[PDB]
Design a binder for this molecule. Structure first.
Ligand code: TRP
Ligand code: MG
Ligand code: MG
Ligand code: MG
Ligand code: MG
Ligand code: MG
Ligand code: MG
Ligand code: MG
Ligand code: MG
Ligand code: MG
Ligand code: MG
Ligand code: MG
Ligand code: MG
Ligand code: MG
Ligand code: MG
Ligand code: MG
Ligand code: MG
Ligand code: MG
Ligand code: MG
Ligand code: MG
Ligand code: MG
Ligand code: MG
Ligand code: MG
Ligand code: MG
Ligand code: MG
Ligand code: MG
Ligand code: MG
Ligand code: MG
Ligand code: MG
Ligand code: MG
Ligand code: MG
Ligand code: MG
Ligand code: MG
Ligand code: MG
Ligand code: MG
Ligand code: MG
Ligand code: MG
Ligand code: MG
Ligand code: MG
Ligand code: MG
Ligand code: MG
Ligand code: MG
Ligand code: MG
Ligand code: MG
Ligand code: MG
Ligand code: MG
Ligand code: MG
Ligand code: MG
Ligand code: MG
Ligand code: MG
Ligand code: MG
Ligand code: MG
Ligand code: MG
Ligand code: MG
Ligand code: MG
Ligand code: MG
Ligand code: MG
Ligand code: MG
Ligand code: MG
Ligand code: MG
Lengths: 46, 102, 93, 62, 77, 16
RNA sequence: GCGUGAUGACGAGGCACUACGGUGCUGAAGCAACAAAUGCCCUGCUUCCAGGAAAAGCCUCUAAGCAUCAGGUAACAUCAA
RNA sequence: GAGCGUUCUGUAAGCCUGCGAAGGUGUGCUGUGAGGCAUGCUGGAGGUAUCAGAAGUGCGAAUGCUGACAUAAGUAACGAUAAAGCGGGUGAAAAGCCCGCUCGCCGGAAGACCAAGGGUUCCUGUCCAACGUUAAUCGGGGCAGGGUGAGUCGACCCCUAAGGCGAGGCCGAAAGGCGUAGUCGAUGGGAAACAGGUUAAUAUUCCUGUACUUGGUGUUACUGCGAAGGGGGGACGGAGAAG
RNA sequence: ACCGAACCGACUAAUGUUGAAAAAUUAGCGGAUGACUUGUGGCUGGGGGUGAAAGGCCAAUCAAACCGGGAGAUAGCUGGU
RNA sequence: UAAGGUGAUAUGAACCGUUAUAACCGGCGAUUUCCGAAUGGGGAAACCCAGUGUGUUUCGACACACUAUCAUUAACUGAAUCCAUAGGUUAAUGAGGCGAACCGGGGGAACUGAAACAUCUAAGUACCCCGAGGAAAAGAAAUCAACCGAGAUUCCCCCAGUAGCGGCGAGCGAACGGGGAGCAGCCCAGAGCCUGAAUCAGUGUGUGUGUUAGUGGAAGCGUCUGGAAAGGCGCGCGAUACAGGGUGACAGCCCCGUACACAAAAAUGCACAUGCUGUGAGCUCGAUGAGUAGGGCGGGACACGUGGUAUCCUGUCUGAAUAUGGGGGGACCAUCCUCCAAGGCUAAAUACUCCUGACUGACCGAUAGUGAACCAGUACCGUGAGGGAAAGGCGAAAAGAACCC
């Protein structure tokens, strides 16, 4: 059966990547929340 | 400065071998000294063909506390305590109890 | 012009292997481990001026790191570049 | 090494740097080829190259 | 934005209060109009987004005075 | 999660 | 399609070792007829209505400008990718 | 209404304790009860009288929370009904690994090459703890070493679609919404390499043979060159039929 | 338009139901040049989208997604104490 | 400052150093790849592609520097349009982004309570956004009071759960006045004598006090048990030091320390004193913030829910007096009292703790205390926002079991 995750690196990076996070104003808030928590990996790029 | 240094004559205050005298070989960073012929342990050395292929049991010296070893006066013939003074700009070490400079 | 500073920095090490030895004994090719930010012209100039031989062409490839386990702690051996340098039939390092 | 390196002029410093870099390259190739039991030479040459760069920057005055 | 250039009037919030006093939020908007004022000092027409209260202030004070005030506050026209 | 015979309707609504 | 590339390469096998896994040497014929694509000519031709991307590379014409200079075309050499 | 116990504070730099503390496990005595006291064995360094003081103060239930361990139970199952047999080798041991001879299954796939996706699973040496629904000498497992070679393939690059962002700008309590010039964005348009051979593992990349493309420089000859502008081209549907 | 593979779908029956599978297998079944199907990419956002309309679908969740927050909502109810 | 040292798991190899270039600690400097506001263009973050100007070439090329946008100012240039403006180019200065909380402002819920619910409460709370600071805000009476007076703002304790508001329900809830903490006043709306004088900022210079490294720092032996003495017993000593930690069991006298006394080449904070720059004080005369106060309509804030409703704010429409005047004194009028709006600046008392040092605890002790005592925001889970663990202890010292079956 076709499941919900059909992966693609290009769509992954355009959706959740660092440059899209910096592009939207609330994405920068997301990065602030993750840095304040102390995540090893902020976005899906690494 | 350190009150007990390398190559001193020291006498053991407390331990297995109280009263024995010896010469300090080297001083470790963790506040422990190795005094020659004092704290003997029986190591079971594992023989290695790459290096040191003989085996056998080997009796070596283990570390003893710098608090446990005390400097040896050799004039009064007993243990002593070391203070610090300034003589001609140099910080020198001297036995208390007759105040003789080492 | 490429500076001697740059050349002495870019050449890193020789490479030893069965394939490298076969390349040396068959096609007059040496295999060199090279710093990653070095280009083909930089490797050619460095070999030509430091080993005092003459180079036909140079071929580069980036060797990827290896994921290793050290006591159930994952680690990653790093990348480097490898260079196959072809010599003109009469050098014989 | 610092004072006698400081008592040299700029051209002497540059050719000293080039000689040190040549020695660094030779030591690196030897150690990679499976020679050079003495690694303190590697450390010493690296730190001396750093010293020569420091004196070059001071003599340029930045 | 619906901000008067002369008097600085901007929308403010209040309530709709009905006969049963049910309070719901609403905005009071200024009576803004874009008017071309003839300035004589420059022999020019300057267009300003100004309320009618602002127009009364214009007519009382003189267009030159309020243009100086606008230039002091820094907004362009 | 849940058993299919508990999600089913003909056997769950057995005594209406 | 034909000629050249090709007196080349490849070639069933045969011969000898083998760490029996595979290597080293040599090597004849190497054409014709017929059938045949959903592939090519074909981004074609015929027809239909539902009327079937854009911009650059490419060719070409001049403005401002340069005007026996730059620049362009054609050959050769060298370098670079 | 009256009390037992537990943790901590004062009395306490006191009292007990390496001639054995707390804790654990038995025994004996004792109180109306919660409990107390003494001691054997394990333990191996702390415990605390008495009278007061403060409470994270007492668990069998909450389809309670977390770990451990039973039960059904050595039971169901061991994942396509394409199928195995034998001889030799290695090994401590072979139904499964290697080699051979048969037998069977697929063969518009259960064969060969890629894109997407993954990341060393590729090849060699060694090991069988754990993983593999059995065993294991085997493995896509552990460990170590090797391996990916480009002017021509693909990206990068030039150019645009849908769409995105968008200097100025128009608009909006603020944040922001839209949008012109621009600038990104392939799934599309744009130059050029083929045959043979080789490695345990790469090849249109290495080698042999024979080619091709674009751009810069420098000689030779002739000469009106030049765009962000004009034109052509690139440049386009469905079906069908035949050579 | 017709018959029929690829491909798309899902009418009937058996198996399975702590499954080989949180929707399949087997044997038959319907469309199969069109209102077709498919790859890559883009757009529409929660009282909102999209809907050849079933309250269907929006990441195994839909008469109002998921995540964090007001929040220890409230509970004249049940359990435990 | 030193006789040892080259960070940890983590040994080993090669070495450096022992009286002063080893190492360690502190001040000042140097280098500081790439991404990131990211700032030369672009981008699927850590990558791709340049333009311009110098300088070097072995003629293949290479090194360095600059080039974002916006705001202000200045120069040059410049349309429809004749001057001018709009625009363009350059130069200089400034900004952008990150950060736990506190602070001012613009917006602003609902569950809930009312034993239902709608005015009301929750609540101007949560949350979103903007801006600033070491604090912010407020602030020098068009304030209160009561015929007596007080004298800016802020914060704590009373007044007082009072007066009041209130489907007069649920609930909300002052002020006057009193006791304290802390105290500070000024400037423009304008002319003249006068000298640049008080007071503030930057930049230096001296004196103290610190901060960032550090130095010295007292006084115990014998014996018994014991693996080991710091324990038992006997006998001494120090104390401006019996705070604390370690040492083979519980140490004032073994070690690190503590009380105490000192120490700074260099950088920097504060309080003074003193130069330069900028700024002006003193006296006399004059002036006294207009689409404003007030009013009509709609709302909001005051404990005050339009009520008999004073007062403040303003979306819309109007609109004075102006010192011979005006505001307030809780509908409103008259008398009296008290103050002077329509400009602004100002320390302290006050609020908080991402961070730094010391000390404390009738606080916890590995299912507790942080989610995390351990390589924890990790493994793992989800497309993503996000969720989110488990896991401490040999011994005093590895003496971590040579060798044989
Ligand atoms: N029992 C069937 C069908 C099924 C699946 N999920 C269900 C939920 C409810 C009722 C039936 C089902 C199965 O396991 O496949
Ligand atoms: Mg080549
Ligand atoms: Mg390559
Ligand atoms: Mg066909
Ligand atoms: Mg206890
Ligand atoms: Mg006690
Ligand atoms: Mg309890
Ligand atoms: Mg229990
Ligand atoms: Mg019970
Ligand atoms: Mg049974
Ligand atoms: Mg049975
Ligand atoms: Mg069975
Ligand atoms: Mg099977
Ligand atoms: Mg067999
Ligand atoms: Mg089998
Ligand atoms: Mg076989
Ligand atoms: Mg068959
Ligand atoms: Mg692996
Ligand atoms: Mg394999
Ligand atoms: Mg076995
Ligand atoms: Mg097994
Ligand atoms: Mg493997
Ligand atoms: Mg576009
Ligand atoms: Mg803009
Ligand atoms: Mg837009
Ligand atoms: Mg483009
Ligand atoms: Mg493409
Ligand atoms: Mg292969
Ligand atoms: Mg049909
Ligand atoms: Mg369907
Ligand atoms: Mg059905
Ligand atoms: Mg079927
Ligand atoms: Mg049909
Ligand atoms: Mg059909
Ligand atoms: Mg219905
Ligand atoms: Mg779903
Ligand atoms: Mg709802
Ligand atoms: Mg609440
Ligand atoms: Mg609850
Ligand atoms: Mg950018
Ligand atoms: Mg950039
Ligand atoms: Mg670009
Ligand atoms: Mg800022
Ligand atoms: Mg409600
Ligand atoms: Mg209610
Ligand atoms: Mg209720
Ligand atoms: Mg202030
Ligand atoms: Mg008076
Ligand atoms: Mg000292
Ligand atoms: Mg001392
Ligand atoms: Mg004693
Ligand atoms: Mg003990
Ligand atoms: Mg006034
Ligand atoms: Mg008014
Ligand atoms: Mg009124
Ligand atoms: Mg008034
Ligand atoms: Mg009044
Ligand atoms: Mg814990
Ligand atoms: Mg425990
Ligand atoms: Mg993941």
């Amino acid at each position: 059966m076709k499941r919900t995750f059909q992966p693609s690196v290009l769509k992954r990076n355009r959706s959740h990547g660092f440059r899209a996070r910096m592009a939207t104003k609330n994405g920068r808030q997301v990065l602030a929340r993750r840095r304040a928590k102390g995540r090893a990996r902020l976005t899906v790029s690494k | 400065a350190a009150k007990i240094r390398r190559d001193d004559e020291v006498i053991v205050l407390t331990g297995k071998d109280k009263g024995k005298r010896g010469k300090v070989k080297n001083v470790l960073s963790s506040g422990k000294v190795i005094v020659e012929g004092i704290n003997l342990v029986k190591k079971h050395q594992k023989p290695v063909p790459a290096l040191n292929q003989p085996g056998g049991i080997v009796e070596k010296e283990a570390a003893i506390q710098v608090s446990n070893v005390a400097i040896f006066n050799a004039a009064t013939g007993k243990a002593d305590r070391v203070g610090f003074r300034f003589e001609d700009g140099k910080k020198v070490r001297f036995f208390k109890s007759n105040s003789e400079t080492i | 012009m490429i500076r001697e500073e740059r050349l002495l920095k870019v050449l890193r090490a020789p490479h030893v292997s069965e394939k490298a030895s076969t390349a040396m004994e068959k096609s007059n090719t040496i295999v060199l481990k090279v710093a990653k930010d070095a280009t083909k012209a930089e490797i050619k100039a460095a070999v030509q001026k430091l080993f005092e031989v003459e180079v036909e062409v140079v071929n580069t490839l980036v060797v990827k790191g290896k994921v290793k386990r050290h006591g159930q702690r994952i680690g990653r051996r790093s990348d480097w570049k490898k260079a196959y340098v072809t010599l003109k039939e009469g050098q014989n390092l | 090494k610092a004072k006698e390196l400081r008592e040299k002029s700029v051209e002497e410093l540059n050719t000293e740097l080039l000689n040190l870099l040549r020695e660094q390259f030779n030591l690196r190739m030897q150690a990679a080829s499976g020679q050079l039991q003495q690694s303190h030479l590697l450390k010493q040459v690296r730190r001396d190259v750093a010293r020569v760069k420091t004196l070059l920057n001071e003599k340029a005055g930045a | 934005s619906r901000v008067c250039q002369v008097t600085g009037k901007r929308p403010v919030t209040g309530n709709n209060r009905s006969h049963a006093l049910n309070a719901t939020k609403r905005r009071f908007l200024p009576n803004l109009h874009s008017h071309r004022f003839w300035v004589e000092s420059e022999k020019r027409f300057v267009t300003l987004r100004v309320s009618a209260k602002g127009m009364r202030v214009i007519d009382k004070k003189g267009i030159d005075t309020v243009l100086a005030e606008l230039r002091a506050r820094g907004e362009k026209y | 999660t849940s058993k299919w015979f508990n999600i089913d309707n003909k056997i769950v609504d057995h005594r209406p």
